[PDB]
Structure 1
Amino acid sequence: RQSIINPDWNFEKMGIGGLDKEFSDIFRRAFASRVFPPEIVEQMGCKHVKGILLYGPPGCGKTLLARQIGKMLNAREPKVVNGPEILNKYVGESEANIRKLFADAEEEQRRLGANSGLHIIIFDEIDAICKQRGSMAGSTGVHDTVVNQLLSKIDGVEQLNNILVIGMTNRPDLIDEALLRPGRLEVKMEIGLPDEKGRLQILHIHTARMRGHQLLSADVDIKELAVETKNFSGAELEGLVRAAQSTAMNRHIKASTKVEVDMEKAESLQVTRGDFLASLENDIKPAFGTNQEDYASYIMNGIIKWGDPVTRVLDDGELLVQQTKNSDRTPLVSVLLEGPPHSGKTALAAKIAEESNFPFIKICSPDKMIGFSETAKCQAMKKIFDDAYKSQLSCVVVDDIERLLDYVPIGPRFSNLVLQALLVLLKKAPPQGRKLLIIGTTSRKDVLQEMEMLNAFSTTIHVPNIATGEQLLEALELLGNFKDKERTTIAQQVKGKKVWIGIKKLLMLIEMSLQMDPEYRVRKFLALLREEGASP
C-alpha cells in the first residue's frame, strides 16, 4: 500500500535541466509498473525491468542523473561501487565481494515475498570491471571470472524481482554483449550535448540563488550568454559562472603585502557583464568544434574589397549555404575553390564558413599531421568526419588538397589510400534528417581532373588574380601605403599596361620595399613589381 515515491517531491527540486525526454523515457520504461495498482499489474504476468545503462561524452550529466534517481526513491540507501573497488589479492575473494551485494535482496524476498521494497545498486565506470571475455589475456584470469559471476547473479537459476542496477560508461563499445540482452540491461539511454534551449535552462538553474539576494546586476542578459556559448556542456557553463564569480570577488582583495580583505566595501558586491565577457575570453574554452582563435589564425590581415570578384565569390557562398540549409532533396552539397597560387583561397573559404552561423564548424588542414603515414592521415580524416555526423547541420573545410595526398610532378608520385578515402567520403550522405556542407580548396585543377575527382564535386568557383592597374591602385589605397604624392608616381608608370600579381605577394613586396631609406622606396617597389612580370 505504501507508495514508492516520497510524499514531498517535485521535478524542479532535483535541479536537472535539458534532459526532459530522457527522464520521461526512463520513467515510462522503468517505474511504470511500480506505481499502478497491484491488482492489474499482477494479472498480466510481467516481470519488472532490472537494468539501465547511460553513456556519452564527459560532462553531460550522468552521475547527476544516477544520484537524483537514487535520492528520489523511498527505499533504502543505494549501495554504490566506486569503480573497480571489488578486487582482492586472495584467490576466490574477488567473486565473494561481487556476491555480497545481493544478500539483503535475496533474504528479504525469501522472507516477505512479492511485497518487498526496491534495492538499488549503482555501478560507476562499469567498463573497469566488466569487459569482453577472452580479451585482456594477461594472467590470473580474475577478470574473466567476475563477469561470469555477475551474469549468473543478475538472472540465473534463482529468481529476483526487487533489484535495479544502473551502469555508466564513456566507452560503450567494450561492454560484454551477453550483459545487454533484454532482461539484464534493457534500457540503454544516450546523454548528448545540449541545444540552445538546454543551454538556457542550465544557465538559469545555476543562477537562481544569486538573483534571490540582489547579488547580480540587471545589466547581465542571459540570452546573449546562451547565444555566444557554442559547443558548451553543463560543466563548462558552471565553470564559466564560477570564474565570473571569482573574478568579481577578487577585486576586494589586496595582495603582495600579506593578505588583507576590505570589510567596508564588501557589502556592495556586484557581478557585471564585463566580468562575464573577460572570463569567457580568457579562461574557459570548450573542446568540441572550432574556436575563434582559429579564424583569427587563418584570416590574418582581414578582407579588403579591391574588386567585384570578392563580392561575387561571397554571394555564391551565401547561395550555397542557404541551399544546403533549407533544401531537403539534397542533404549533401560540395564546392571547390580553385585559382592560381597566392590568390586568397583559404581566407575566403574560412570567411564563407564563418559567416554561415552553423553550430558545428571544423577545418582540416595538412599542417597538423606532419610526418604522418597514410593510415594515420586516413584515421584522422575519418575521426574529423565522424563528429559531423552527430550534429544537426554542419560544415567542413578541406584546404590544400594537393598536400593531403603527396603530389610531386616528378614521377608522378602520390598516395592512393588517401585519394580513395576522399573519393568515398565525398558521396556518403549523413544519417537521416541531417545536413552537411564541404568546401575544398586547391590550386591544380588539371591534376584533379586527371584523377576523376572533378565530378565528385557539385560545382566550382574561380578566385582570380589582380589584372588591371586600377585594381592595384585601389588595393594600395585601401591598404594605407604610398600615400599623397608618392601614389601619383606609381599611377603614372602602371596604368599604361597590365599586371598579374596575387594579394599575398603584394603585401610581401610592400614590406620588402618599406625597409629602404625614404627616397628609394618607390623605385625599389617598381623594380620588384617589374621583376614579377608574367601572364597566363
Structure 2
Amino acid sequence: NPDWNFEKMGIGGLDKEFSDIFRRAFASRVFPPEIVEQMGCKHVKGILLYGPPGCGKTLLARQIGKMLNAREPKVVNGPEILNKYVGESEANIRKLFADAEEEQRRLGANSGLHIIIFDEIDAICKTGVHDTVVNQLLSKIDGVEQLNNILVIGMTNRPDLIDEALLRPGRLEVKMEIGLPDEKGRLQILHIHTARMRGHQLLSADVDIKELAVETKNFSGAELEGLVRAAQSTAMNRHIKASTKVEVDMEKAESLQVTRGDFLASLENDIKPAFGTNQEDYASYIMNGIIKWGDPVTRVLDDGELLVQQTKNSDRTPLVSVLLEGPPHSGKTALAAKIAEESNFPFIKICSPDKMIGFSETAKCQAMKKIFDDAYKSQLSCVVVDDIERLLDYVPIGPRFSNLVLQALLVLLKKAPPQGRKLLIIGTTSRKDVLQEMEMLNAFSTTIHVPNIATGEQLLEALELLGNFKDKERTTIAQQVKGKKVWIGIKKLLMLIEMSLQMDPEYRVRKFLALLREEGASP
C-alpha cells in the first residue's frame, strides 16, 4: 500500500498532514479502479503548497516524485512560457502534455502517473497573454477530455493573489502550509558544513556546534553557509596583513582554523538575518532585580504560585484571572513579570501601551484580539496586561475614556479557550476605585495587594540590601527615622537616592533626609 511514513520526507510535522493524505485525501488510487469507476469518486489532481521561502517545499516535491513509480516530473522555473510572439506560450503549455496524452490515449488512465511541478505559479496565473495562458491551462487540466494520470503541484508564498477559479474543486483540491527551518534541521545543516573541516583536524576543539545552532534563528541554508564563510574569512585574515597596498598571506596562511571567536564576530557584525527573530526583553520590565526587603514580596509570590498551580491542574476552571493592586510607584509590573517567568509555561506574552502610541480604539482592539488569538493556539498559556487605565485612556475630567476597549476587555475576561486548553490572565493597575465604579472588578476572579514601605526598619533593611550608605550615616538615619512611620515606594526611593548622591559627601545625608521629609505622606 502507500504506507505513508513522513519520516521518509526527512522533515518534521508532516506526520499529521501525511496521515491526512495517505488515509483519506489520496486513497481511491489504491482502491481497485473498476469499483471506483462503477460508483463514482474522483481522483485528486490538484495540490497547492504555500509558505515562506525555504528548502522544504522543493525537498517535499522531490520526495513525492520518489514517493511513486512515476515519470520524471516536469518543472517550469518562473514565467519562461511568456514569449514575444503570438501563440508560442499556450503552444508550449500544450507541448508539456506530451507523454500524458501519449499514456492517456495508448493506455488511457491505465498508464503511469505524471507529475507536474510549478514554481512561482503566481507569476503566470493571477492582459491578453495572461488570460490566454490561464484559460489554456484550465482547459488542459479540465476540459472535454479528462486525464486521470496527471498531478499538478504548485508552490507560492502569496496564495492570496492566485486565481480563484484555479481553486475550484478538481483544479486545486489539497491545501498545504509550510513553516521555517527548525532547530534540528539547522543542526543537520551545520554538521553537513563543519564535518568536512573536522576530518582534517583543522577546526579548534573549543567550538561547540550546538551553541551556534541555538543562536542562529530564522537562518536558511544559504544564510548558514554565508555565516560559515564569514567565520572562515575572519579566521584567514589573521594571516592576511593586507593594507592600503595589499601584502596578503604569510608563512602560516595555511592550516587555518574556523575558531569560535571568528564565528561569533561574523554572526554579530558581518552577517545579518534577512527576517530577524522574536524578542523577550524581561530585563526591560525587570531592570534592577527583586530584593526581599520584607514579608509582602514572599506573600505575593506564594499567591502567584498557588494561582499558577490551580490553573495547571483544574478541570472545570480552565480560565483564571487575578488583579494586582496598590499605590503608584509600588513596583507592580515587575512582580507580575516575575510571576509569569516563574510560571514556566510554553507561551508567555506581555501587552503594554508602550507599543501602541497614537493608535485609535480600533487599532488597540485589533492588537489585543491578535494577542489573545495567538494565545488560544497553545495548550496552556499566560498573558499579562499592565496599566489598564492607560489602555482605556482615562482622565478625571469629564471623566473620559474609550468604551470599545472596555467592552472588549469585559468580553475577553470570561471567554474560555477551546476544549482541553488552559489560560491565565494577570492584570495590573493602581486605581481600584475607578475600575470598581465601572463594574469591572467583578470580572476578575481574585485580587492581590502590593504594599508600600511603612516602618523605618524596613527602610533601613532596604538601604542595607542596596549597600549605598555606610554605618556612620546609617546610625544617624536610624536615629532620626526609627521613631516615626514612613510612606514611600521603592522606585521613588531609588530615584531619591540617585538624586541625593550627586552632591559632595558633607551634605549628602542632610540632602537625602530633606528629600525624605518633602516626599513624606500617610495613607
Please report the TM-score for the alignment, with normalisation by the length of structure 1: 0.79
Cα shift readout 1:179-215 (whole Å, capped 9, x = no counterpart): 4454332322333468877777777677666666656
Identify which range, 68-77 or 441-450, moves more after superposition.
68-77
Deviates more, 1:504-513 or 1:188-197: 188-197
In the alignment, structure 2 segments of 5+ residues that lack a partner are none
Query: Which of structures 1 and 2 has the larger relative contact order (alpha carbons within 8 angstroms, sep 6+)?
Result: 1
1:216-271 deviations in Å (ceiling 9; x for gaps): 66766677778778888888877877776776666665554666776766775556
Greater shift in the superposed pair: 156-165 or 383-392:
383-392
Partner of 1:410, secondary structure, is coil
The answer to whether the Cα contact below 8 Å between 1:290 and 1:362 also exists between their aligned partners in 2 is no
Query: Cα distance, 1:502 vs. partner?
Result: 0.9
* CA distance in structure 2 between the aligned counterparts of 1:302 and 1:53, rounded to whole angstroms: 51
Alignment gaps of 5+ in structure 1:
1-5, 132-139
Larger mean Cα displacement after TM superposition, 403-412 or 436-445: 436-445
Q: 1:524 deviation in Å?
A: 0.6
The 5-angstrom pairing of residues 132-211 of structure 1 reads: 140=127, 147-172=134-159, 175=162, 178-192=165-179
Residues 4 and 19 of structure 2 are in contact (CA less than 8 Å); yes or no, is this contact kept in structure 1?
no
Offset, 1:86: 5.0
140-149 vs 371-380, greater mean Cα deviation: 140-149
Match of 1:78 in 2: 73
Superposed CA deviations along residues 58-117 of structure 1, whole A, max 9, x for unmatched, are 548333323443466555443334455555688887766655544552344224423443
Say if 1:407 and 1:414, in contact at 8 Å, map to a contact too: yes
Q: Identify if the C-alpha distance between structure 1 residues 443 and 9 changes in structure 2 by more than 3 Å, giving closer, same or farther.
A: closer
Task: Give the direction of change, closer, same or farther, for the CA distance of 1:231–1:409 in structure 2 (3 Å limit).
Answer: farther
Deviation of 1:288 (Å): 9.8
Is the 1:509–1:525 Cα contact (8 Å) retained in structure 2?
yes
* Structure 1 residues 529 and 323: CA distance shift in structure 2, 3 A: same
Contact 1:54 1:190 survives alignment (8 Å): yes
Tell me how far apart the structure 1 counterparts of residues 232 and 24 of structure 2 sit (CA, whole Å).
41
Contact 1:289 1:362 in 2 (8 A): no
CA contact (8 A) 2:501 2:508 kept: yes
Secondary structure at the aligned position of 1:304 is classed as: coil
Change (3 A) 1:511 1:213: same
Deviations 1:302-334 (A, max 9, x none): 222212222222232233333334444333333
Query: Deviation at 1:351?
Result: 2.4
Displacement of 1:393 after TM fit? 3.3
Write the distance in 1 (CA, Å) between the matches of 2:120 and 2:248.
43
Shift of 1:348: 2.0
CA contact (8 A) 2:326 2:450 kept: yes
How much has 1:126 moved relative to structure 2? 4.3
Deviates further, 25-34 or 155-164? 25-34
Question: Is residue 38 from structure 1 mapped to residue 33 from structure 2 by the alignment?
Answer: yes
Q: Distance in 2 between matches of 1:288 and 1:332?
A: 35
CA shift for structure 1 position 483 = 1.6
Deviates further, 293-302 or 514-523: 293-302
Q: Which moved more, 1:152-161 or 1:114-123?
A: 114-123
Deviation of residue 51 (structure 1)?
Answer: 1.6
> How many pairs are equivalent?
523
> Share of identical aligned residues, percent?
100
Q: Distance in 1 between matches of 2:304 and 2:277?
A: 20
1:339 offset after TM fit, Å?
1.4
For residues 200 and 293 of structure 2, the distance between their equivalents in structure 1, rounded to whole angstroms, comes to: 56
Q: Give me the whole-angstrom Cα distance separating, in 2, the residues matched to 1:292 and 1:231.
A: 13
Moved more, 179-188 or 403-412: 179-188
Aligned to 2:232: 245
- The Cα of 1:167 is off from its aligned counterpart by 2.2
Change (3 A) 1:354 1:500: same
* Distance change in 2, residues 1:404/1:41 (3 Å): same
Of 175-184 and 310-319, deviating more is: 175-184
Aligned CA distance change for structure 1 residues 77 and 363 (closer, same or farther; 3 Å) = same
Cα deviation for residue 498 of structure 1 reads 0.9
Q: Tell me how far apart the structure 2 counterparts of residues 68 and 520 of structure 1 sit (CA, whole Å).
A: 79
Give the CA deviation at 1:521. Answer: 0.6
Does the Cα contact within 8 Å between 2:6 and 2:15 map onto a contact in 1? no
Deviations 1:264-288 (A, max 9, x none): 6677555666677777777889899
CA offset digits 1:482-532 (Å, max 9, x no partner): 223122211111111111111111111111111112211111110011000
The change in CA–CA distance for 1:303 and 1:428 in structure 2 (over 3 A counts) is same
Indicate how the Cα distance of structure 1 residues 456 and 10 shifts in structure 2: closer, same or farther if over 3 A, else same: closer
Provide the TM-score with structure 2 as the length reference. 0.81
Aligned-pair CA distance for 1:295? 1.8
Aligned partners of 1:231 and 1:359 also within 8 Å: no
